[model samples]
Target: DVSGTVCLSALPPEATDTLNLIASDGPFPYSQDGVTFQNRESVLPTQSYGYYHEYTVITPGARTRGTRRIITGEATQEDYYTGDHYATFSLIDQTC
Candidate 1:
């Protein structure tokens, strides 16, 4: 069911780490890394409250959450990546 979406392998290494955490449910580095994504901006697909969750991606420097975010659906395996805050998003091919 995943063919035309962005591949997970093509995403940043930090994203891979985030994915691992999301998969294994392990010791995440950031306290606020894993949280519920409000999606008030409507930048992502239409999902009800608590249907989507968000995680932060370290940008090595800069400051704050760094603008990059990884949002997962209620199922959690399905993922969407955003580099410019919530201004944009790309579905992450779950096959990888």
Candidate 2:
């Protein structure tokens, strides 16, 4: 679904940085960065319990981690991003 993919250059700079951190086995920016995603809303494709994990994307002006997130499936290393908390998700890029 290329149509649903978020272009690598189109994302926030912080998001791109986080993407690299994930694949590189990062020194992530936050302690909760590598925690389980849970897929509680069930809008994303189904896999299994613990199949997905999440990372935070820094919002430039927000004091907290903000609502943005990067979710990845550990088994596949597939990646998705959400700008509005977990209400919606967009695939980060090809091979993400």
Candidate 3:
């Protein structure tokens, strides 16, 4: 099971103090040092449901046959808000 919710808005306050919300399932690794995010259990922000951020992943044998999954992250506003940013990721497969 994989769940989603991510949204960071209009950043520019020194990049929202190096904002961070990252995830990876394959080949979408990130770094600020080590352990960037993988099969992540949870991350909750959204500040009372605005600038939303919520995530979850439950991989119980994840389909079992050379299971392939992917998730990626980049909410970096670390300087001048870098550029326009909005985010969304979704996955749901309940025993298809």
Candidate 4:
């Protein structure tokens, strides 16, 4: 379930980089990094459109953007990590 929480220290370096970029308002590696996440999967908590923004977590050795992602919520600055695309999600709990 999407109720699980992952420690910020537990994520990969690339994911950390993405988070940092998001915090600083990035010149992201991928142009699609800051696009609105429509939450079509309905796995995340319900929120209005534009409330979530998606960012790419670079996958080493992959030719494409890969499946990992970090989705950010506007109101709480909450972050959700999805390692297997949008099939599932885990909240990124920074206190670790």
- The predictions' CA RMSDs to the true structure, in order, are 3.1, 2.6, 16.3, 1.1
Pairs with backbone N, CA or C atoms under 3 Å apart (clashes), candidate 2: none
Best by TM-score: 4
Q: How does candidate 4 score on lDDT?
A: 0.90
Which wins on lDDT, candidate 2 or candidate 3? 2
Q: lDDT by residue for model 2 over 1-88, one digit each (tens)?
A: 1127777678888888888898797899887788887887687877788888899999998888899988887656478888988888
lDDT of each: 0.78, 0.81, 0.26, 0.90
Clashing pairs in 4: none
lDDT of 2 at 92: 72
Residue-level lDDT of model 4, residues 1-96, one tens digit each, is 486998989989888899889989998998888999999978998989999999999999999999999999886658999999888999998787
Looking at model 2, residue 81 earns an lDDT score of 83
Where does candidate 1 stray beyond 4 Å? 1-4
Better of 1 and 2 by lDDT: 2
Model 1 weakest lDDT span, ten residues long: 1-10
TM-score of each: 0.84, 0.86, 0.18, 0.94
| Model 1 lDDT at residue 51 | 85
List model 3 lDDT by residue over 1-96, tens digit each: 222422333322322222232222223122222232332323322223223322222223535212122223333421111121112233321122
